[PDB]
Amino acid sequence: STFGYVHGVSGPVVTACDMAGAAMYELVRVGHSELVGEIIRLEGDMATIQVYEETSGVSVGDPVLRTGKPLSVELGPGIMGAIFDGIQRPLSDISSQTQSIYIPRGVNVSALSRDIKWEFIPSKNLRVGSHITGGDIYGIVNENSLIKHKIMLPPRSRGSVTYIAPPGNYDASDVVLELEFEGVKEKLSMVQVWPVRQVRPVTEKLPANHPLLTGQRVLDALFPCVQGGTTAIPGAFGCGKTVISQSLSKYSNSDVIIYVGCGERGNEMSEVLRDFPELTMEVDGKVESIMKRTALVANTSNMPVAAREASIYTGITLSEYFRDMGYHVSMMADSTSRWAEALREISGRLAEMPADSGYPAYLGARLASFYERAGRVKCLGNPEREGSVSIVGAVSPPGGDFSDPVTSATLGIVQVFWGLDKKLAQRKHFPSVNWLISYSKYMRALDEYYDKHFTEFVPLRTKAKEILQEEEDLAEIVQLVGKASLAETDKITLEVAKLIKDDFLQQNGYTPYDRFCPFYKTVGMLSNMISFYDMARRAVETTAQSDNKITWSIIREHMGEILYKLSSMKFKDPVKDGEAKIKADYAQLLEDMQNAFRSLE
Amino acid sequence: NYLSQPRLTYKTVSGVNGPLVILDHVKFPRYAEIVHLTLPDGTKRSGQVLEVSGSKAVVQVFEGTSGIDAKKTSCEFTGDILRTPVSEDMLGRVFNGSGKPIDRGPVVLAEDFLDIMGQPINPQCRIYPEEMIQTGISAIDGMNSIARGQKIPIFSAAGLPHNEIAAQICRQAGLVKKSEENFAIVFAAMGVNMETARFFKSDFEENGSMDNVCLFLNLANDPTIERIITPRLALTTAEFLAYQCEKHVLVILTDMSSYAEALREVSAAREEVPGRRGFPGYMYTDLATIYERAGRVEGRNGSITQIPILTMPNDDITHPIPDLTGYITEGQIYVDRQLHNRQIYPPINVLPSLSRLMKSAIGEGMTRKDHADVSNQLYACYAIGKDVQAMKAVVGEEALTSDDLLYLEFLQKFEKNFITQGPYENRTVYETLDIGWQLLRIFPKEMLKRIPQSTLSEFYPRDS
Amino acid sequence: VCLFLNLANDPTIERIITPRLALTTAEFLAYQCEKHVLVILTDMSSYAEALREVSAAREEVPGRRGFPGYMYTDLATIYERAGRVEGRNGSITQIPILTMPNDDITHPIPDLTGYITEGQIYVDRQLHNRQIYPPINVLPSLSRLMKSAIGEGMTRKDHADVSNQLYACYAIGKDVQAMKAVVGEEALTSDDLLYLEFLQKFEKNFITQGPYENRTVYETLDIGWQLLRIFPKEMLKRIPQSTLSEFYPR
C-alpha cells in the first residue's frame, strides 16, 4: 500500500509508520489536509519526514501518502508566462482558482494545466516501427508566436514506436506516443517529470565561444560574457541591478529567460512581478511581450524554507529543459546569498555541525555543482542541435566583505564579475559598472570570434583599458603637479580618458537612440576615440623634441569641432540610421580628423 | 460544520519536568492542541501540546507546573488548536498577551474565528507600496518617509526613549489629509515592565486616541508562551481589519528582542541544540513569518504597514536579532545615545537611518512636489555640517571659510528646530517641509546644489 | 600519462579514494616496473572538503575550522607515498596543488600540509595582479631536500651561498619598501636605495620568465650573481671571502 500513518509530531518533524519500502528523499503527503514533506531518515518500517508547511493540528494516526518521486519538475507545454514558487506551485493559478490573497496549507494544483488543449504536430517522417532514443523530438506544440515547444522523448527512455498521434488538439493528459522495448511498453503524453537535483544529460559538453550581447557598451566591449558562461553581480540596494535584468530580458541574443527569486522581501518581489509582464520587445517588426519567452520562480522570505533552497534547482532544471530543445537560455538568480541562508537554516534544523560561519560543510560543493550546469552542449537524441544555459547570479556580501563564505566561493567559481557600484550610481553615471574592479576571463575564448567578425576590436579594447588605467595612475599626481605642469601626452591621456568615461561608458537606456547599442556601433565609436588618441600622441611626439611643439591646448584650439563630433557619435540611431549610414558617418569623422591633424603636422 | 462531540478528560499524568507535563493513554493526540488543567486544590491552568508520539502527549503549561502531582491533577483536551475571536469591535479595547480583556469591558463577540498562525500572502496578489503614512515626527516624515505597505524597524538600545517614540507614533499617526476615517492602529508590546505597561495604557486614554487603537499588553512576568502568541493575535487582527474591513492598519510591535528571548526559551524546552550566538537555527523563518504579514494586495483598498521596535545589545548592529531583521525589512530608523546624552528628543540620527521605499511615499499628489528635493538637500547640509564641526577643534574656527561658517550655523539650527520636537507636539508633513525651508534659506540659493532651479524659484523666497 | 578525473558534478566521496587509486598506480609503476613517476594531485582542498563532509556525518571529534581531528594523519597517508627505496631504480615525486581559502596560509589545509610535505611553492596574488609570470613569491616558499641536492659536484660550488644571499637581499628590499610607504623617498639613504633597486631587478630578471622559457641551473645562478653584483661586496654578509673572490669579479 502507498499509505503509512503518523506515529508522532514535534515541530516540522513528522515520524510515520507502515512506511516500509519508502525511499530516501521521496516526497510525501501528510495529514487529511495533505501537507508536503520529504523523507530524511529510514529505520525499520518507520520514516522521519521533514514537513515543509505548518504541522499545527496534525494528529497521531493521520494518513501519510508516499509519492514515488523525489523533488521533481513537470516539464512540458505551458511553462512560458508561468509564475512558480521554488517547488513549482503555480502562484497565478492558485490565486485564480482559490479566489484568495493567501496560499492554502496543502494546496494541490498541478504545475501545468491538464485543462488546456495544445495544437500538436508530429515529426512527419516518424512511422510505426521507427527506432527512437532519449532526447528525440517526436512533435511540436505551437505554444505562442515566439516559442515552438518541441516535444522530446525523456532521457532514460527508448524503443520501437508502436503508436503516434495524428495532428490535432490534445490535453496534457492525452497519450500522444507509445513505444515498446524488450516487449515492455511505455505510453507518453506531452509532459515529462525530472528530479531537480539530477543534471539533465547531453551527448557532449562544449567550450563556450559566441558572446552573449546585452546591448550595453561597457559589458559587451570591456567585460564580455559568452553564451554558456557564468557571471556574478553585487546584489545591493543603490547599485541599480535592473539594467542587467532588463538588458538580458529585452535585448540579449538569448532565446528563453528564466528568473529566480531565492528569498526576497515581500515588497521587492512585488516590483519584479509588477514590472516583468509590462516589458516588451520588437520581433518581426511587431511588438511582443517579454512573457512569451520567460518564466518566473518567485519566493518571498516567508515561503517554506525548502522552497527557498530548491529555488535555484527548479530554475536550472527548467533552463536545462529548453537547452535540450536547441535553444539558448539565460538564467538570473536574484540573490544566491538568500539561497545559502535557506541552506544554513535547513542544516541547522537537521542539527548538522556548523563548519565555517555557521554554513554547512558542503556549501562550496553545492555552489560548484550548481554553476557547473552552465555551458554550451550538443543535445541528446536524433535531430542534430546545440543549445546552452548561461547563469547570472547575484551575491550580497555583508557591508561589501568579499571574505564571506558564499561570496568567496562564488567569486572563486564564476568567470565574470560585473561590479555594479553605488558610488558611481550617486553621480548619475549609468550603467553603474566599476571598470577598475569589474573583469571577464572569457577573452582567450572569444578571441577567434572577434578575429573573424570584427578584427580591429581586440587592439582597441586593449588601448582603451590602458587609457582607463593611466587616468587612475595620474589621479594622485595631478593633485601635486597642479594639472598645468603635466606632460602634453598625459594631458591627452586625461582628456581622452574623460571622453571615453563620459561618452563611451555612459549609456542612458531611456533615450531612444541608446536603449540598445549594437556591436558594430560599439566598435565604430571606440575605433574613432582610439584613432584620435594615436593621432594626438603622434602630433606631440613628432614635435616635442625641439619644435614650437604641439600641446593639448593647441589640439583643442585647432580641432574643437572634431572633439565635439566625437562626443556626438553616441547619438547615432539604429532605428532610423542604417548600418551603412552609421559606418559612413564614423568613416567621415576619421577622414575629417586626419585632414585636421595633417593641417597641424 | 461545528466540532459537536464531547471533550475527554484524563488523570494519566506520567511525569512533570520543568515547564512540561507528560500524559499517556491519550486518544489520537493532536499537535499544538490546547488543553485545560485542574490542579489538586481546584486551581485551573492552561497548556498547549508541545509534542505527540503514539499514546503520549507532552503539554507546555502556560502558568507554572508548581503544585501539579501525578495522582489528583487532571487535564481536558479541547479538541482544537488555538484560534482567536476577531471583530471590528476590538478597536478601543485593551487585551493581555492571550486575548483576555483587561479594560473592564465584556469579552469579544466574534465576527469570525481565525487560526492565529494564518497563511502566507500570495506573491502574485501583493502590490507595490504607495502613498505616505504621516507619523507626525519630522525626522521620520521629512527624511525617512514611510510608504503604505512598507515594513521598517526602529533600532534602539537599553535606556533610550524608544517606548516614548512608539507611544508618540501611536498617538499621532494617520493619512496625510491632502487637498482619520479608514485608519486603525494595532499596538502589541512584549515583555513590558509594569511601569511601561501602565505608561502605554494611561497615555492612550489620557490623550483621547483609543478609538483607533487595539492594544495587546504582555508584561515581563506574564507566561512566555503569551509572548509567542502576542504578535500572532496582533497580526491576525491587522489582517482582518485591513483585508476584510478595508482599513489602512499601522502595526507597532514593541521590543522584538523580548520576543526572540522567549523563542529561545521554548526551543530549549523542546531540548533543541542552541544555534548561532545562542538563538534557534530557524529564527530567520520565525521572524519572517511576523514581518511578511504586511503590504497592499490587489482588489482590496486596505493595507498593513509595520514598525518593529528592537533593542540591540552593546549597541552592536551585528547581533543576530538586528542582523536578520535587516534582511527581511526595508529600511531602518536609528535611535542614538549621543543625541540622548545631549538631551535632544526624539534622539533619531538621520545619517545611518534610511527608508528604502521613500520614493514611492513622497511627491506631488502624495505629499508635495518639493519633498524629494528638500530631503536630499537637508541630508547633504547635515553631513557637511557634522564634518566642519569635527574639524573646528582640529584647526580652530579662525581657519574656517565663510562657506564652512554657513554650514556650522545650519547644523546648530537643524538640531534645535528640525530634529528637536515635543513629545506632545504634532507636525504635518507640511510643517515638516516648511521648517525645512526655514533652514535651507540660511544659504545663498547657488549653494543648494541638490535642488533644481524650478523648485528654488517657487519655494526659496518668503511669500506675503 | 595516466589521468583520473572526478569533476565538480561527480560524487564527493569518490574524491577520498581518487588520490589512493592514483598513488597505487604510481607505486606499481615505480616500485615494480622501476619507472620514475611524477604524481600530480589537483586541488587537495577538494579532498579535504570532501573528508570534512564525510566526517561531519559520523560526528567524529572536530579540529580547527571544523575539519576532522585526524586530518593530519589522513593527509600523511597520501603524502608519505613518495620517494626512493633500496635496491629498486624507480621513484615517486609528488606535486599536490592546493587552493588556500581566502589566501590564508594558517588555514588547516595549507597548515597541516606544510607540516608533512618537504617544502612548498607559494603562488602570490600580489605578483599575479602585477602581471608577472610565474607569480612565485620566494619568501613563504621552501624546499627541505634542496640543502643536499646542490653545491660542488651536484650543481656549482656557489649555489648554496648565492641562494641564501638572494633571500637576504629580497627580505631587506621588502623591509625598505615597507619603510618607504611611511616616511617617503627623501628619508631613504643610498644603502636603502640599493636594496630597493635590487628588488625591482630581481622580480623582472630572476622571477619573471614567460610560459615556455627553460633556463638551465647555470643561467639561473649567473642571473643570480648579476643582481648581487649591484651591492659593494662587503654588504654580501651571507657569502664567505673564498666564494666572493672567485665569482663576484666576472
Binding site: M353, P354 | E271, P274 | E59, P62
Partner: peptide, 25 residues
C-alpha cells in the same frame, strides 16, 4: 556545540535502555 550534541546522544541511549527494560517488566 560538539558537547551539547554527544550529551543528547548519551541521554537518547539511556532512554532507549530504560524503555527496553520496561519491555522486561
Amino acid at each position: 556545540f560538539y558537547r551539547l550534541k554527544k550529551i543528547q546522544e548519551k541521554k537518547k541511549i539511556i532512554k532507549e535502555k530504560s524503555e527496553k527494560d520496561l519491555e522486561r517488566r
